[PDB]
Amino acid sequence: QIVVGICSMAKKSKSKPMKEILERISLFKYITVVVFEEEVILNEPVENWPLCDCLISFHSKGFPLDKAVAYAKLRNPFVINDLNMQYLIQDRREVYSILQAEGILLPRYAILNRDPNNPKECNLIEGEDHVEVNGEVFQKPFVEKPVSAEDHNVYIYYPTSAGGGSQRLFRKIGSRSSVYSPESNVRKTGSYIYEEFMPTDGTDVKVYTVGPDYAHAEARKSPALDGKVERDSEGKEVRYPVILNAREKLIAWKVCLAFKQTVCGFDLLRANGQSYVCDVNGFSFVKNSMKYYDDCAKILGNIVMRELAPQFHIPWS
Ligand SMILES: O=P(O)(O)O[C@@H]1[C@H](OP(=O)(O)O)[C@H](OP(=O)(O)OP(=O)(O)O)[C@@H](OP(=O)(O)O)[C@H](OP(=O)(O)OP(=O)(O)O)[C@H]1OP(=O)(O)O
Ligand SMILES: Nc1ncnc2c1ncn2[C@@H]1O[C@H](COP(=O)(O)OP(=O)(O)NP(=O)(O)O)[C@@H](O)[C@H]1O
Ligand SMILES: [Mg+2]
Ligand SMILES: [Mg+2]
Ligand SMILES: [Mg+2]
């Protein structure tokens, strides 16, 4: 049997989407799925972790990525989502750098790197309706993102013509994803990316790749709108149908390969007749789509068979 090892925190390994996909991968005649226990991941040396021939492993809060890296170096499995790139995905500066290198449209942006010992010495000038970051001007509205991609406290600053103030976004809590603040001045501690505000129809397109030739997309109300979350009777956030155009399918292909994340989520802003990537999240499954579960499991199983069947002497077509 070809062994597919799943190495992530229990919140992710035991999530409904994961269980749905793993039960389908297990239907492959020659594949056995082994899910690494969280206590093993956290507390056992990598020399004691189960063997696998193919490793599906990804970082989330609390995950020891150094250990996953060392395990992959020790056992040299076929890796679905590259582990070293998951360090880079944690830093928005690195993500935007890669997007640019790949010719991928993204918002105009500038990085404000601030010395926490000398926070006033950074290259920021503030006016009432703009900032200048390293000399580069952003007229309001503009967006201010923590350099850490794991920090979801993204702020939007409104122009005086709109009443000023700001929208403070955050990881959703029940009914809300953002709140208005009367504060018009930018944050004065921390490092940020400042970027131009892309006007959309008030929705975000969320894209989910399974390899570079498959992507599911769906739309959700932008948290930047009023911050009330649309929920169904099951308490799931409301999603809207999307079909990606030819340009956007290429974007997905590029993102998947550039970040070496077979399973990869990222966000698109449909604005001004083009589509701009504003965030790359790495490993993420679509939730609540039976067809995606089927498709994702089939594609992953096929990738495993295509790579490893010859060395196992298993016929595969
Ligand atoms: O980006 P999408 O596709 O919306 O997935 C996120 C997911 O949103 P949803 O389940 O509503 O789609 C987020 O779930 P959450 O916002 O809690 O959803 P809900 O309000 O239904 O409980 C998840 O956050 P966490 O579980 O609280 O850490 C959030 O986790 P994060 O990646 O932001 O933080 P992590 O916990 O991974 O460090 C995401 O889960 P993932 O992509 O499966 O990891
Ligand atoms: N340049 C922009 N112009 C307009 N809206 C933006 C822009 N950047 C971000 N947004 C909006 O703000 C939301 C959050 O920003 P995003 O860069 O996705 O932060 P995040 O903290 O990485 N979210 P997550 O997808 O949960 O990891 C997006 O989904 C958009 O609705
Ligand atoms: Mg099986
Ligand atoms: Mg996002
Ligand atoms: Mg993100």
Curated annotation (Swiss-Prot):
Q: What is the effect of changing K206A?
A: Loss of enzyme activity
Q: Where in the cell is it found?
A: Cytoplasm, Cytosol
> Which residues in this protein are found as Phosphoserine?
S181
- Where on the tree of life does the source sit, at the highest rank? Eukaryota
**Amino acids binding substrate:** K11, K12, R171, K172, K206, R220, S284, F285, V286, K287
Domain description from the entry? The C-terminal acid phosphatase-like domain binds PtdIns(3,4,5)P3 and InsP6. Despite its similarity with the phosphatase domain of histidine acid phosphatases, it has no phosphatase activity.
Describe the disease involvement stated in the record for this chain: Deafness, autosomal recessive, 100: A form of non-syndromic, sensorineural deafness characterized by prelingual hearing impairment. Sensorineural deafness results from damage to the neural receptors of the inner ear, the nerve pathways to the brain, or the area of the brain that receives sound information.
* Protein name, entry field: Inositol hexakisphosphate and diphosphoinositol-pentakisphosphate kinase 2
- The species is Homo sapiens
According to the record, which residues of the full protein are present here? 43 to 359 of 1243
